[PDB]
Amino acid sequence: TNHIKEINWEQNTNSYIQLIPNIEYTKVEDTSLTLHLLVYRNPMDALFNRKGNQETYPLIIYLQGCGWGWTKQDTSAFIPQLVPFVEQGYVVASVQYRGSGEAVFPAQLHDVKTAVRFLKANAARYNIDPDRVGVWGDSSGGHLALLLGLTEGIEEFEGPDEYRHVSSKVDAVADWFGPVDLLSMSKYPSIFDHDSPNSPESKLIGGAVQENRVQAKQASPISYVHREAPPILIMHGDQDDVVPYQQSVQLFEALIKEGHDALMYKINGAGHNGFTQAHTLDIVKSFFRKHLKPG
Amino acid sequence: TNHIKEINWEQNTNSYIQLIPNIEYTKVEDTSLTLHLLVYRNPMDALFNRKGNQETYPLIIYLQGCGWGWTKQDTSAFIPQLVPFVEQGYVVASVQYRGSGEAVFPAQLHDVKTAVRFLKANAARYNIDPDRVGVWGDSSGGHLALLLGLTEGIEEFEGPDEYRHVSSKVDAVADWFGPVDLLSMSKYPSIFDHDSPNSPESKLIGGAVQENRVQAKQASPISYVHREAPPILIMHGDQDDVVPYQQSVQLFEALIKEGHDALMYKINGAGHNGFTQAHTLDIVKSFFRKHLKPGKAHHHH
């Protein structure tokens, strides 16, 4: 029982995944906006001035939903689900955007556009390949993810004069029950009254959506399906009592009609919850593997 | 042929692991000390007043090493390696302790003892089973994990008058190349002069270790191996140029001599780096499964 066990150790292998939280990527007024980063990095290497990991990886940006501020956006909560994506050969960032109590749309899009450009511009120090960028979000984050895909090159949505020498285009979009058409949301049952001036959608645009239709359409992904777009993955539970399942059906049919590469899954018996079971996460993993090509 | 595809969803299944960061567990002066928590929790549930997770899980506390403040402790860095532990049926917390530049030993032990009591006292809020607590640390964090296992019942090491109605005992200790005997560190090669007044060890206790042998011994896990101890896991690389490998051998042989349940792995060809490869993390997982028994219903008899 005085026996010491012995085991070997593989040399020259990246196996430490480091969480780097609270990276400030922009500052509007006195409000700094942050992102959290996950990357293959052994923290001992920086501490002892050793040559770090030289590999570059495709990037996945995660946009946590929050009703654009209906609740305070929690960019840390989903991080444990992002860790296995690093293992597939990605860098992952979870990005904060401003709530509608701070500024109305397109401020939220300005924020995530700027985060994309920040991550591309500073790519080398984060082991990022800036040419391969996917974005993934749930509910209001899925809404913004769609807009990153569908509003590429629209100058009024770029935001501040920061990192303008890189593009804010993304190469793949994964949408978990994201709002699609603000004016059609109240057509189907929900626990929210989405037409109320106090709804998350009305606050997003600064007025009751049915009474402010130009601004409601400006903030709707459905308004941009005629534009060029990267491949899009849509997933939505048929029991979702927050974002009607028909929002995603409407998006999917409009994208197909326009000739877009779109994939949609109906999650039977699922509601307004992240699709964090293994077989549903595999769909997201397969989608980004196809279009971002880790390895 | 591009139709909506259907896939099924399992009900009554926990699959969301939530990271809950920056939980303040104590405050000294105006210095707030925090921990990060990982737990099976779907954040939608609290947001919409749904039934939440009512299971309790054994707790693993991780103590990130930092030379006791030789560098600023980073309690977030290791978080991705702790996530798969939650999937095995634990709650995991990564705990901040003060640097020696703020306070000398036993301040660091006061901090992590108070973290144990805080987590036990607030266990219901975090799905924790307070009767099954393991602790795991690397380098100076492994040093503190050993002291948690070995110094139970010593009032001088409890810290502030906070949550003193619960005990700071732990039930299993995992030690990654933690310093063991501050006075014997310099007996073997290292890129530090651990006897220097500027060494992390000397700053920990407030002076050059060989001149302050009383405080150095009080701060050394080796001084407590005769006391009652939980099961202990020790892992150390034989190329470690920061903490001499023979520190862990010295600890292991002394634990065995006292009749304790000790397990040690020499990691051949590894140095002073976390053992984050799958086959070495599995050893930690097997150790905590054996002694904390996740997935088993647990009562106190």
Tab-separated table of N, CA and C in Angstrom, chain A residues 226-292:
chain	number	residue	atom	x	y	z
A	226	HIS	N	-34.415	38.994	-48.044
A	226	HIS	CA	-34.068	39.136	-49.455
A	226	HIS	C	-32.585	39.406	-49.673
A	227	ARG	N	-31.838	39.714	-48.620
A	227	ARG	CA	-30.426	40.021	-48.751
A	227	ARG	C	-29.603	38.735	-48.731
A	228	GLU	N	-28.327	38.863	-49.079
A	228	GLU	CA	-27.427	37.728	-48.977
A	228	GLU	C	-27.238	37.348	-47.514
A	229	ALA	N	-26.964	36.071	-47.280
A	229	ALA	CA	-26.917	35.563	-45.918
A	229	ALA	C	-26.017	34.345	-45.868
A	230	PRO	N	-25.337	34.115	-44.751
A	230	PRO	CA	-24.638	32.852	-44.561
A	230	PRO	C	-25.640	31.748	-44.276
A	231	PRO	N	-25.207	30.490	-44.242
A	231	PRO	CA	-26.130	29.416	-43.850
A	231	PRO	C	-26.711	29.653	-42.461
A	232	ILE	N	-27.964	29.242	-42.292
A	232	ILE	CA	-28.729	29.528	-41.088
A	232	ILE	C	-29.317	28.229	-40.555
A	233	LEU	N	-29.134	27.987	-39.259
A	233	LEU	CA	-29.757	26.875	-38.550
A	233	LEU	C	-30.815	27.427	-37.608
A	234	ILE	N	-32.020	26.863	-37.664
A	234	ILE	CA	-33.144	27.297	-36.839
A	234	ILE	C	-33.605	26.116	-36.000
A	235	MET	N	-33.762	26.337	-34.699
A	235	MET	CA	-34.323	25.311	-33.824
A	235	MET	C	-35.347	25.928	-32.883
A	236	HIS	N	-36.501	25.279	-32.739
A	236	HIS	CA	-37.597	25.880	-31.991
A	236	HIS	C	-38.488	24.782	-31.435
A	237	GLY	N	-38.847	24.903	-30.157
A	237	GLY	CA	-39.724	23.922	-29.535
A	237	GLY	C	-41.179	24.223	-29.857
A	238	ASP	N	-41.958	23.163	-30.074
A	238	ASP	CA	-43.353	23.381	-30.442
A	238	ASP	C	-44.251	23.670	-29.243
A	239	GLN	N	-43.705	23.719	-28.028
A	239	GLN	CA	-44.455	24.137	-26.847
A	239	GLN	C	-43.971	25.469	-26.299
A	240	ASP	N	-43.146	26.192	-27.050
A	240	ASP	CA	-42.608	27.463	-26.579
A	240	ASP	C	-43.748	28.444	-26.325
A	241	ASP	N	-43.925	28.841	-25.067
A	241	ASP	CA	-44.975	29.785	-24.707
A	241	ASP	C	-44.446	31.203	-24.549
A	242	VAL	N	-43.217	31.462	-24.995
A	242	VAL	CA	-42.623	32.796	-24.965
A	242	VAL	C	-42.457	33.352	-26.376
A	243	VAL	N	-41.733	32.642	-27.231
A	243	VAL	CA	-41.631	32.981	-28.647
A	243	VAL	C	-42.421	31.938	-29.429
A	244	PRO	N	-43.499	32.323	-30.107
A	244	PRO	CA	-44.312	31.332	-30.818
A	244	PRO	C	-43.484	30.548	-31.825
A	245	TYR	N	-43.708	29.234	-31.830
A	245	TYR	CA	-43.052	28.344	-32.777
A	245	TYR	C	-43.215	28.823	-34.214
A	246	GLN	N	-44.352	29.444	-34.533
A	246	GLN	CA	-44.609	29.903	-35.896
A	246	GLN	C	-43.676	31.033	-36.329
A	247	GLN	N	-43.034	31.734	-35.390
A	247	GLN	CA	-42.009	32.703	-35.771
A	247	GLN	C	-40.915	32.037	-36.595
A	248	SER	N	-40.442	30.871	-36.140
A	248	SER	CA	-39.369	30.175	-36.840
A	248	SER	C	-39.861	29.545	-38.137
A	249	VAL	N	-41.086	29.008	-38.142
A	249	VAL	CA	-41.673	28.513	-39.388
A	249	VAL	C	-41.741	29.632	-40.419
A	250	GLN	N	-42.198	30.813	-39.990
A	250	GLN	CA	-42.303	31.950	-40.898
A	250	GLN	C	-40.939	32.308	-41.476
A	251	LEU	N	-39.919	32.378	-40.617
A	251	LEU	CA	-38.561	32.652	-41.079
A	251	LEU	C	-38.092	31.596	-42.070
A	252	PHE	N	-38.252	30.319	-41.713
A	252	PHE	CA	-37.766	29.233	-42.557
A	252	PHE	C	-38.398	29.287	-43.940
A	253	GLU	N	-39.717	29.481	-43.998
A	253	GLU	CA	-40.395	29.513	-45.290
A	253	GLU	C	-39.943	30.709	-46.119
A	254	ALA	N	-39.737	31.863	-45.478
A	254	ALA	CA	-39.280	33.032	-46.225
A	254	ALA	C	-37.854	32.842	-46.726
A	255	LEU	N	-36.992	32.221	-45.916
A	255	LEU	CA	-35.619	31.979	-46.353
A	255	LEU	C	-35.578	31.004	-47.523
A	256	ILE	N	-36.373	29.932	-47.455
A	256	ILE	CA	-36.420	28.964	-48.550
A	256	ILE	C	-36.946	29.628	-49.814
A	257	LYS	N	-38.010	30.422	-49.680
A	257	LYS	CA	-38.560	31.119	-50.835
A	257	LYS	C	-37.515	32.004	-51.499
A	258	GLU	N	-36.610	32.583	-50.716
A	258	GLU	CA	-35.577	33.459	-51.251
A	258	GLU	C	-34.357	32.709	-51.771
A	259	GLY	N	-34.334	31.381	-51.679
A	259	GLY	CA	-33.193	30.625	-52.163
A	259	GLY	C	-32.074	30.436	-51.163
A	260	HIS	N	-32.323	30.676	-49.882
A	260	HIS	CA	-31.259	30.589	-48.895
A	260	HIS	C	-31.032	29.154	-48.441
A	261	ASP	N	-29.791	28.881	-48.052
A	261	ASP	CA	-29.424	27.649	-47.363
A	261	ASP	C	-29.916	27.765	-45.927
A	262	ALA	N	-31.046	27.136	-45.628
A	262	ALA	CA	-31.598	27.178	-44.286
A	262	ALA	C	-31.971	25.774	-43.846
A	263	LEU	N	-31.757	25.517	-42.565
A	263	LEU	CA	-32.049	24.238	-41.942
A	263	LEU	C	-32.879	24.524	-40.703
A	264	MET	N	-33.997	23.825	-40.546
A	264	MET	CA	-34.806	24.012	-39.348
A	264	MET	C	-35.225	22.696	-38.712
A	265	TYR	N	-35.179	22.665	-37.381
A	265	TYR	CA	-35.604	21.518	-36.592
A	265	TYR	C	-36.720	21.930	-35.644
A	266	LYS	N	-37.803	21.162	-35.653
A	266	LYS	CA	-38.876	21.292	-34.681
A	266	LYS	C	-38.564	20.377	-33.505
A	267	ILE	N	-38.399	20.953	-32.316
A	267	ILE	CA	-38.074	20.168	-31.127
A	267	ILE	C	-39.395	19.798	-30.456
A	268	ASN	N	-39.858	18.576	-30.720
A	268	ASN	CA	-41.160	18.128	-30.243
A	268	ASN	C	-41.197	18.052	-28.723
A	269	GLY	N	-42.213	18.676	-28.132
A	269	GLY	CA	-42.388	18.643	-26.697
A	269	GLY	C	-41.484	19.573	-25.924
A	270	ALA	N	-40.620	20.318	-26.599
A	270	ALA	CA	-39.770	21.282	-25.924
A	270	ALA	C	-40.431	22.653	-25.936
A	271	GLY	N	-40.122	23.442	-24.911
A	271	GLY	CA	-40.631	24.795	-24.823
A	271	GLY	C	-39.511	25.814	-24.865
A	272	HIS	N	-39.675	26.906	-24.122
A	272	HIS	CA	-38.728	28.017	-24.128
A	272	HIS	C	-37.578	27.701	-23.168
A	273	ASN	N	-36.699	26.807	-23.614
A	273	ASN	CA	-35.521	26.402	-22.863
A	273	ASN	C	-34.413	26.083	-23.849
A	274	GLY	N	-33.175	26.393	-23.468
A	274	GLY	CA	-32.039	25.998	-24.275
A	274	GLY	C	-32.098	24.522	-24.609
A	275	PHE	N	-31.746	24.158	-25.842
A	275	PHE	CA	-31.774	22.757	-26.262
A	275	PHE	C	-30.452	22.094	-25.876
A	276	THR	N	-30.270	21.950	-24.559
A	276	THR	CA	-28.998	21.537	-23.978
A	276	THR	C	-28.857	20.027	-23.844
A	277	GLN	N	-29.815	19.252	-24.344
A	277	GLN	CA	-29.627	17.812	-24.349
A	277	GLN	C	-28.633	17.434	-25.445
A	278	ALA	N	-28.000	16.268	-25.270
A	278	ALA	CA	-26.842	15.909	-26.089
A	278	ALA	C	-27.191	15.840	-27.569
A	279	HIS	N	-28.334	15.244	-27.907
A	279	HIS	CA	-28.663	15.061	-29.316
A	279	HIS	C	-29.066	16.378	-29.978
A	280	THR	N	-29.639	17.315	-29.224
A	280	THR	CA	-29.919	18.616	-29.820
A	280	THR	C	-28.655	19.461	-29.939
A	281	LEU	N	-27.737	19.354	-28.976
A	281	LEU	CA	-26.471	20.065	-29.108
A	281	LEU	C	-25.643	19.512	-30.259
A	282	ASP	N	-25.776	18.212	-30.552
A	282	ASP	CA	-25.057	17.620	-31.676
A	282	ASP	C	-25.448	18.273	-32.997
A	283	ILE	N	-26.716	18.663	-33.132
A	283	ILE	CA	-27.162	19.366	-34.333
A	283	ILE	C	-26.395	20.671	-34.500
A	284	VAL	N	-26.282	21.448	-33.419
A	284	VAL	CA	-25.522	22.695	-33.476
A	284	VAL	C	-24.065	22.405	-33.810
A	285	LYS	N	-23.499	21.364	-33.190
A	285	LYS	CA	-22.114	20.996	-33.458
A	285	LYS	C	-21.916	20.588	-34.913
A	286	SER	N	-22.849	19.806	-35.471
A	286	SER	CA	-22.721	19.385	-36.867
A	286	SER	C	-22.809	20.578	-37.805
A	287	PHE	N	-23.704	21.516	-37.500
A	287	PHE	CA	-23.889	22.690	-38.343
A	287	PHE	C	-22.616	23.521	-38.413
A	288	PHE	N	-22.027	23.834	-37.258
A	288	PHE	CA	-20.830	24.667	-37.274
A	288	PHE	C	-19.627	23.914	-37.827
A	289	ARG	N	-19.547	22.601	-37.586
A	289	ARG	CA	-18.500	21.794	-38.201
A	289	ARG	C	-18.538	21.926	-39.719
A	290	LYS	N	-19.733	21.810	-40.299
A	290	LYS	CA	-19.883	21.882	-41.750
A	290	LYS	C	-19.367	23.209	-42.300
A	291	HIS	N	-19.741	24.323	-41.669
A	291	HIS	CA	-19.498	25.632	-42.257
A	291	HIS	C	-18.272	26.348	-41.703
A	292	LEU	N	-17.797	25.984	-40.514
A	292	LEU	CA	-16.608	26.610	-39.949
A	292	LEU	C	-15.377	25.721	-40.008
